[PDB]
Structure 1
Amino acid sequence: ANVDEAILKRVKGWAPYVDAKLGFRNHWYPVMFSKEINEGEPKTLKLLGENLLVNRIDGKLYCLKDRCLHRGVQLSVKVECKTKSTITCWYHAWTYRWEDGVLCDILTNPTSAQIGRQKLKTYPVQEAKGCVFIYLGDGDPPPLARDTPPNFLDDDMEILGKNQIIKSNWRLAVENGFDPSHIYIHKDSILVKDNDLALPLGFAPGGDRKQQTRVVDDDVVGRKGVYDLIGEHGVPVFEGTIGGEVVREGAYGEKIVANDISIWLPGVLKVNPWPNPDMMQFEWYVPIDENTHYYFQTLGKPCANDEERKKYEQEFESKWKPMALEGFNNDDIWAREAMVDFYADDKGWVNEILFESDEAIVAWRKLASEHNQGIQTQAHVSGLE
């Protein structure tokens, strides 16, 4: 229960989603890139409100909760790995094994009855496409594919990316990237011209509700998402008018991009093709706590050899990353933050006045509320009563 009951009782269509301000438990989440964590160099990170520790032992990644069982201090305050397979708390030397979190020794009293009887929480970790995924959940984890958008795990798909921390709840990030009409904020994008792309100001829906989106619940890989089909039966708006007078126009170009966009649990958007007819963008909105998230953005592009990478790698650092990920998506970041106040007291979930193009967002909320694997609460974070 992370939200006032009176509010959850009003949004009968997607209460679980409104309540999930701390994110969905029992899902995988990219937290960093493999190149960021070397052998024997523990890194700290907060995910779904839980402080965690990640270490690489014999090339393999391990995840232990960053909070001693004794007096609850963060082990990372002073890292003490005395053996390849363990970590010793700097306070009273309680020692845990990275592979199962078991308390195997206590240097301050090797005769303690606690030894071998206590266990520190651990979480599954899997590397893929140069990305580190942590299963923030309990029990046996599902295939990493279930929480990845289609085409991310392709053998030839060269996945390159960037990562940073953004000051907004994760949901606001999701509903901004999957908002068909938010493209208006990009209307002055230099990338659009510097890649002569075609981008309308918005869209005039066509057809009925159902046709506006494609809800996925039959994928065998387990995925759960929604495709935004506003562009099929809808006429793009390239000329903005106020009182019959035209005051703004979209951008013209031969390059037809983003003619396919989908949002998938636990919170990753797929815009294909983008930022080029050959490339693709995959971006996660990872919940760190109730007010921040990791903006994990990547760019996929098929290849088949060294030369099909070094040139790309050169492109990424040269134009793409700076133009598409930063220069273009930076407009999304401050738009994301502009919605914080309205939803901060949870009142926005009841007072928002939606219009046609929000049909997609609504589908997403219903999907997420129905197929999320669990709601993260303060009980999971501090003291599970």
Structure 2
Amino acid sequence: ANVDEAILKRVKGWAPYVDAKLGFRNHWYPVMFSKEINEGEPKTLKLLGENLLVNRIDGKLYCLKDRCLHRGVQLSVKVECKTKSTITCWYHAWTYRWEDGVLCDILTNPTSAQIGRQKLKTYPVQEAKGCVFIYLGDGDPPPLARDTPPNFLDDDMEILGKNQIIKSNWRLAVENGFDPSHIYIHKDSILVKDNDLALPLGFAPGGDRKQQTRVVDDDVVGRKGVYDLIGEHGVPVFEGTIGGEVVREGAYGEKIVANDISIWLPGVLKVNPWPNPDMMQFEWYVPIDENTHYYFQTLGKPCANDEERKKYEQEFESKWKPMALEGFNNDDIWAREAMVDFYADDKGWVNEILFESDEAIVAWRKLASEHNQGIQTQAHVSGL
């Protein structure tokens, strides 16, 4: 597998998840924004450890594996698209069609028997809400809705976001995001103060284990996720004490937000409402390789017309993006990086000492282990 068998045997509750160091194969993943790739201008990227090339031909997106079948070089070292529908390797000129990856010509040996008998791996690509999703999997893809949080694809939902590469395994990003008690790191958030938001330091759980979360095994669209319900019977903590004496307090804002938090396979978090009562935040932690992920952030707001979308776009660039996506979430970034060492040798998955609020994370680990569509392995990446 991807992890020492001795460790996998130990984590009987969620071995597939611990083994999924490279992410889950056979799911859709957003990797860039539509306006980032123009007609006839191939773009490179790495997803689930695989180097890919994406091109826009006649407005439509196509995805080919960035690895020549011949000597395994990346075609992108020197891109040569000699006809609108093909790409020619810069080394010995093996030429492939973007449409189906078939080897259709070899400039240096036009009559080779390999022509029409070899095919470069291709992956489905779909655009939605200005986002570019790639189905990193085999066979016919399921509807995109299965791998997106509820409402993301709503007709009136206006989506704007930001994307960047963060140095941590995708799972550490997922868990931090869905961690009920991690809000402690945001106690000094400027956003919280300026937007007058109510933000406790944490929650004293109430009720039984089962009431702490709400697991969704299937919307009519087949999505799988978990809602964090620690606040349904829990007591929000606003005064932090040590030895019985107050040493810290939470935010007593009047605006109540983020009362709806859910994590969905393949790894996208939905926080609603946030950062404002009329908005929603959806963020993906896309696996690039075992040590890196794309932190694909998006903010949604229902807009009924071109005027509202224009206004939203304005507040996004001037306020939400800088104050929320960057200001508030920047703390999440270094928090993720801080867990790298403990989990790097895979030992942290055994030595971690969890407490009550981690019930949410446990539910996610079990959901992911039970309903993922496949474990990406090194064999998929290279493999002989």
Q: Given the two structures, how large is their TM-score scaled by the length of structure 2? A: 1.00
Q: How far did residue 154 of structure 1 move?
A: 0.5
Once the two structures are TM-superposed, the CA of residue 331 in structure 1 deviates from its matched residue by 0.1
Q: Secondary structure at the match of 2:252?
A: coil
**1:5 positional shift:** 0.2
Give the drift of 1:219: 1.3
The question of 1:96 aligning with 2:96 is answered yes
CA–CA separation in structure 2 for the residues paired with 1:322 and 1:308: 20
Per-residue CA deviation, residues 265-292 of structure 1 (Å, 9 max, x unaligned), is: 0000000000000001000000000000
Structure 1: runs of 5 or more not aligned: none
| Cα separation, 1, equivalents of 2:189 and 2:233 | 26
1: CA distance between counterparts of 2:112 and 2:288? 36
Measure, in 1, the Cα distance between the counterparts of 2:69 and 2:327. Answer: 45
Q: What's the CA shift string for 1:27-54, capped at 9, x where partnerless?
A: 0000000000000000000000000000
SS across alignment from 1:231: helix
Which whole-Å deviations, capped at 9, do the CAs of 1:202-259 have from their partners, x for residues lacking one?
A: 0000000110000101311100000000000001000000011000000011100000
C-alpha RMSD of the superposition: 0.5
Q: Give me the whole-angstrom Cα distance separating, in 2, the residues matched to 1:363 and 1:103.
A: 46
| Distance (whole Å) between structure 2 residues aligned to residue 140 and residue 231 of structure 1 | 40
Q: Name the structure 1 match of 2:61.
A: 61
SS at 1:46 equivalent? strand
How far is 1:190 from its partner? 0.7
Q: Which moved more, 1:216-225 or 1:153-162?
A: 216-225
Distance 1:300 1:250 in 2: 27
Aligned-residue offset at 1:309: 1.2
Whole-Å separation in 2 of the counterparts to 1:145 and 1:218 = 12
Distance 2:14 2:194 in 1: 41
Three-state SS of the structure 2 residue aligned to 1:77 is: helix
C-alpha distance in structure 1 between counterparts of 2:6 and 2:253, whole Å:
49
Equivalent-residue separation in structure 2 for 1:218 and 1:332 (angstroms): 29
CA-to-aligned-CA distance 1:6-65 (integer Å, 9 cap, x gap): 000000000000000000000000000000000000000000000000000000000000
- Per the TM alignment, residue 311 of structure 1 is displaced from its structure 2 partner at its CA by 1.0
Kindly report which structure 2 residues correspond to 1:16-35, keeping only aligned pairs within 5 A, or say none.
16-35=16-35
- SS across alignment from 1:16: helix
C-alpha distance in structure 1 between counterparts of 2:23 and 2:383, whole Å: 18
**Offset, 1:191:** 0.5
Deviation at 1:316, TM superposition (A): 0.6
Alignment gaps of 5+ in structure 2: none
CA distance in 2, matches of 1:117, 1:307: 53
Partner of 2:43: 43
Match of 1:179 in 2: 179
Question: Normalising by structure 1, what TM-score?
Answer: 0.99
In 1: Cα distance, 2:382 partner to 2:5 partner: 21
Q: Percent identity?
A: 100
Q: Which runs of 4+ in 1 moved over 2 A?
A: none
Matched position secondary structure for 2:13: coil
Q: State the distance in 2 between where 1:288 and 1:27 align.
A: 14
Q: Does 1:141 align with 2:156?
A: no
> Deviation of residue 185 (structure 1)?
0.1
Q: Distance in 1 between matches of 2:219 and 2:361?
A: 20
Q: Within 2, Cα distance between the matches of 1:219 and 1:51?
A: 33
Structure 2 SS opposite 1:104: strand
2:58 and 2:360 mapped to 1: Cα distance? 45
User: Aligned pair count?
Assistant: 384
Partners in 1 of 2:111 and 2:186 — Cα distance? Answer: 65
Q: Tell me how far apart the structure 2 counterparts of residues 304 and 41 of structure 1 sit (CA, whole Å).
A: 33
Whole-Å Cα distance in 2 between the matches of residues 24 and 272 of structure 1? 25
- Whole-Å separation in 1 of the counterparts to 2:253 and 2:179: 22
CA displacement 1:366-385 (0-9 Å, x = unmatched):
0000000000000000125x
